[PDB]
Amino acid sequence: DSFVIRGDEVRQIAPGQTGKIADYNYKLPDDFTGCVIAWNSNNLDSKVG
Amino acid sequence: ASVYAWNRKRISNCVADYSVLYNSASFSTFKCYGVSPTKLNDLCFTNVYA
Amino acid sequence: FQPTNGVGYQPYRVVVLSFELLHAPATVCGPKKSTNLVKNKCVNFNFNG
């Protein structure tokens, strides 16, 4: 599952966490088995303005 | 290169296109001193040090 | 997103890998290479996980 989120929303991609992304956008199960791999993409996903 | 060994390039004897620098949406700082940044395309110079 | 925004407000690309382990035969296996089968002798085996 691939998506783009801001830096303070990375900690909500974990089992048992809360937040706007966890409630309304992407919720992981509490019995989740697998990995979360997040990297900065400021060059590809930001433009000036 | 590192800032103590900053790289200098001599630009001369070519036609220069400054529109590709200005329209790019990655340059956060485009601060021009003594020349208008929009009027970089208008003027002619002899030597450019990068 | 802007490139001048702080790291809380910078783009991060997230890939969540979720592995499911059912009773079905395993299809996603790692790069470990198979060995020859040894029979009638006590061995330590890894049979498809």
Contacts of A28 (CB under 8 A, 6+ apart): A13, A14, A15, A17, A22, C16
Nearest CA in chain C to A36: C16
Q: In chain B, where does DSSP find H-type helix?
A: 19-22
Give the experimental resolution in Å.
Answer: 3.6
Matching residue, tokens 């900690």: A11
Judged by CB atoms closer than 8 Å, whether chains meet at B26 and C4 is answered as no
Torsion, CA B32, CA B38, CA B42, CA B44, rounded to 10 = 10
Q: A9 exposed, middle or buried (CB, 10 Å; 0-12, 13-18, 19+)?
A: buried
For residue B48, the surrounding DSSP H or E stretch is strand B48-49
For residue A30, the surrounding DSSP H or E stretch is none
Q: How far apart are CA C16 and CA A47, in angstroms?
A: 26
B28 close to A (CB below 8 A): yes
Q: How far apart are CA A8 and CA A47, in angstroms?
A: 20
State the amino acid at position C37 in one-letter form.
Answer: L
Judged by CB atoms closer than 8 Å, whether chains meet at A47 and B28 is answered as no
Q: How far apart are CA C33 and CA A20, in angstroms?
A: 44
Contacts of B48 (CB under 8 A, 6+ apart): B10, B11, B12, B16
A14 close to C (CB below 8 A): no
Matching residue, tokens 């930001």: A46
Q: Which of B26, B28, B31 to mutate to test the interface with A (most CBs of A within 10 A)?
A: B26
A47 close to B (CB below 8 A): yes
Contact predicate C6/A1, CB 8 Å? no
Residue among B11, C14, B1 nearest A41 (CA): C14
